[PDB]
Design goal:
Two copies of one chain form a homodimer.
Chain A: H1 14-22, E1 29-30, H2 47-59, H3 72-83, H4 88-91, E2 95-100, H5 102-117, E3 122-127, H6 132-139, E4 143-148, E5 150-151, E6 156-157, H7 159-166, E7 174-178, H8 191-204, E8 207-212, H9 221-224, H10 226-234, E9 238-243, E10 256-261, H11 265-280, H12 288-298, H13 301-331, H14 340-343, E11 348-350, H15 355-365, E12 367-368, E13 374-376, H16 385-395
Parallel strand pairs in A: 1-12, 3-4, 3-7, 7-8, 8-9
Antiparallel strand pairs in A: 2-10, 5-6, 9-10, 11-13
Helix pairs in contact in A: 2-12, 2-13, 3-12, 5-6, 5-11, 8-10, 13-16
Bound molecules: 4'-deoxy-4'-aminopyridoxal-5'-phosphate (PMP) (2 copies) and 4-aminofuran-2-carboxylic acid (2 copies).
PDB class: transferase
Keywords: PMP, sadfa, transferase
Assembly: dimeric
Chain lengths: 396, 396
């Protein structure tokens, strides 16, 4: 049965990780990482998370299955984060949330749900996007088409090209939007650009799918949800796939949510029964530990305050590194404009380096980025900034 | 998009659970449960598990993502449980294991892997089986066909009918086998019957898929794996979907494994790269907490000893309830043979009651079973046995 199976493509990131590990130079710096790292180069368990885990160890009396949609309190806290406390969508019971194994799990549940229960055949994704978006949608039998996004000259959002690309989308296609901290570019629509897109989406009959993996990493929890909320004010229907992997440092516990919105309670409940059926046929019901930690924190004033500050600390360190990176490049004689780095949001930016400059950086200097030139600014520290920038200058 | 979606069928078990909760009779007994319960009616967290969770709280320094296939030690301990320490399959590196979100997650990964990378179109499942088997395989685009299994007259394995049904299976079809504690019947092949099936499967060109959700609940860890090991001795290729939900009381933490076996190392590694691709496009990588608890326990002599005894306690309580149930029915004047209950394995048996007797039991006596007459013997206790049996006698 298996004798003729073709191997899956490697698999950079791991290929990159492995090369990085093997490298014996002093010296070496990994900007190809996917996770947050603090100033010491560590990805620690958040203090709010450790405190919550201690409470659960003391208080849990069973591991009996969660419902298919997971912990009720998790769903309620999630909807408040997404839509705002006192949202009409919440008041009118137009939203249903399933706790899922991570953001990826939420995307796959949305995809299986749409493929099985609707006429959706196609999902529109930005060029560029997270490479796994295509894999997820294709796995559910959905075609993926790309829309223009990145202006490689100004390092900004090519808004005209975006709108023009999307005119090819038909009524009933899904359009995927990154809620904030666009991956890989860090370029997000302004609120006014979000509002323009919300109106266009209504007129064109698109089903919005928000991917919200970085809430809190751009400006703050509420501000990062402005775009989503602009859409939610205008649309009868939408889906949100959110993730707590980065903003709770809960990567490996697989903590996400798929939130389904419909015109009214009756309709969302009926549609959600089929979303639950898609979950049941996949992993049955979701992993408790990570989501219970999230619900415990979000629903407790003391823990929530500690967590909000820890998230602020991450957002602030990232922004400080963006600033230090631009200043240091200027100081090491880059002599070209990297100011775009300050205005971009979250962990990731395109450096503007070519694929060959990236290969040179790795081979000659032991500085590792993704082949596209995407760098994780949380791999930068005050201590590694100077040699990092000296290397970059050397390949320009 | 969602206005015309048809609701998913309810959903017994929850429908059953809800009726049970609403019932105001003293009095009431739920045998429709899916989980183990101890003599007090509780599903506690195992002591070995609490101890492991304490160690992880003290020792974890990151939640950084696991690899796509999860924790290496988990995979190694899993293969030893399945195949036996010193197995040729292990020595020859013919097996690769992905940690998955539960047994269901392992089944879906196996199904997506097969649908995408092989000529498999069809999976053969026993009649009866766990109802979610059909849903999982169909979700991946695979047809499900049934093979005969249950002799409703003798309450035994209709081995002739099984073999005759399976002659309709073509070379390259998958045949699903429950490793031990067949669900819902508790009827397992003898070792000699397993050996006969192993030889037939080789001759007919079937790909065996073992579903192993109850290892340790029939006779013991090693004995429960005899059937699987008989197949593994004969086959170049097979898949095992196993679950630790019941034998570790880790239901909600979603702890399972998909183990792929091929003729040799080169072949399994190549095939496994595509299994990892199927995982990546689904939930990306698996939840750490539950599997880390399992690996911690299995790899530590002291914790493993405590856990093995806790599992023995569960297996023994189940067998005691089977015995008490048969004795009590005889004593309450059932006056028909229920001896089959003693010989069946695990939590579940068909009582032999009709759908109408089951409905009567619930309406008149507040005794709840699944509509098929399947009962969970772990819902029985020395204290509830007499009224349970009095009710059953009353509907015969
Ligand atoms: C845009 C985007 N979508 C979703 C994901 C997947 O998140 P998770 O690791 O929670 O599955 C990521 C990675 N955090 C991402 O960058
Ligand atoms: C035969 C069978 N297969 C697999 C499963 C699913 O197991 P899990 O809850 O770990 O997903 C069950 C329920 N334990 C089952 O009875
Ligand atoms: C978090 C997990 O993966 C990423 C990535 O960009 O691949 C972020
Ligand atoms: C464990 C989870 O579900 C069952 C069932 O029979 O449905 C057992």
């Amino acid at each position: 049965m298996f004798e003729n199976i073709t191997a899956a493509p490697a698999d950079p990131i791991l290929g990159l990780a492995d090369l990085f590990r093997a490298d014996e130079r002093p010296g070496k710096i990994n900007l190809g990482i996917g996770v947050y790292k603090d100033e010491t180069g560590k990805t620690p368990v958040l203090t709010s998370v450790k405190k919550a885990e201690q409470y659960l160890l003391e208080n849990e009396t069973t591991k009996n299955y969660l419902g298919i949609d997971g912990i009720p309190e998790f769903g309620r806290c999630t909807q408040e984060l997404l839509f705002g406390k006192g949202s009409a969508l919440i008041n009118d019971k137009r939203a249903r949330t399933a706790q899922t194994p991570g953001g990826t799990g939420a995307l796959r549940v949305a995809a299986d749900f749409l493929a099985k229960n609707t006429s959706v055949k196609r999902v529109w994704v930005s060029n560029p996007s997270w490479p796994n978006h295509k894999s997820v949608f294709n796995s559910a039998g959905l075609e993926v088409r790309e829309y223009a996004y990145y202006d490689a000259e100004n390092h900004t959002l090519d808004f005209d090209a975006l709108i023009n690309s999307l005119n090819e989308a038909q009524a009933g296609d899904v359009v995927l939007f990154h809620g904030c901290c666009h991956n890989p570019t860090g370029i997000d629509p302004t609120l006014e650009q979000w509002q323009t897109l919300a109106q266009l989406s209504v007129e064109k009959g698109w089903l919005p799918l928000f991917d919200f993996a970085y809430q809190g990493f751009a400006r703050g929890l509420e501000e990062d949800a402005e775009g989503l909320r602009a859409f939610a004010a205008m649309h009868k229907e939408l889906i949100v796939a959110s993730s707590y992997s980065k903003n709770f440092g809960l990567y490996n516990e697989r903590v996400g949510a798929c939130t389904l919105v419909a015109a009214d309670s009756e309709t969302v409940d009926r549609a959600f029964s089929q979303m639950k059926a898609a979950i049941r046929a996949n992993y049955s019901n979701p992993p408790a530990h990570g989501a219970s930690v999230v619900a415990t924190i979000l629903s407790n004033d003391a823990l929530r305050a500690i967590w909000e500050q820890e998230l602020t600390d991450m957002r602030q360190r990232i922004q400080r590194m963006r600033q230090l990176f631009v200043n240091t490049l200027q100081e090491k004689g880059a002599n070209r404009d990297f100011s775009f780095i300050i205005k971009q949001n979250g962990m990731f930016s395109f450096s503007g380096l070519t694929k060959e400059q990236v290969l040179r950086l790795r081979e000659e200097f032991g500085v590792y980025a993704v082949a596209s030139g995407r760098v994780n600014v949380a791999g930068m520290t005050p201590d590694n900034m100077a040699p990092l920038c000296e290397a970059i200058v050397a390949v320009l």
